[PDB]
Amino acid sequence: GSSGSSGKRFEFVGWGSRQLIEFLHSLGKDTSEMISRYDVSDTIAKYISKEGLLDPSNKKKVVCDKRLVLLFGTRTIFRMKVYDLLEKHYKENQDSGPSSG
């Protein structure tokens, strides 16, 4: 083997934030080409269950364990919010307004 690593670090790490990246890296996701949110989100929904982050009081919710925390930084979230949660991480200018609906 013999390859570079990284030169001249800049905002984010590719298309998504390191947080999301790393998280995907660990899981074993090949953050090669811009992945579709739905996917990452879908994987999250699976991972949440896979690991068992789900909540007993309400499965509809999600109880972050660590990875999710290091990702979002929250203790609990909505299995759905996931999509949005990522919507943030992911780069790419997102035009919207006026108002935050």
UniProtKB/Swiss-Prot annotation:
Domain SWIB/MDM2, residue spans: 9-92
Highest taxon, organism lineage: Eukaryota
Identification of the protein by name: Uncharacterized protein At5g08430
Residues shown, of full length: 25 to 112 of 553
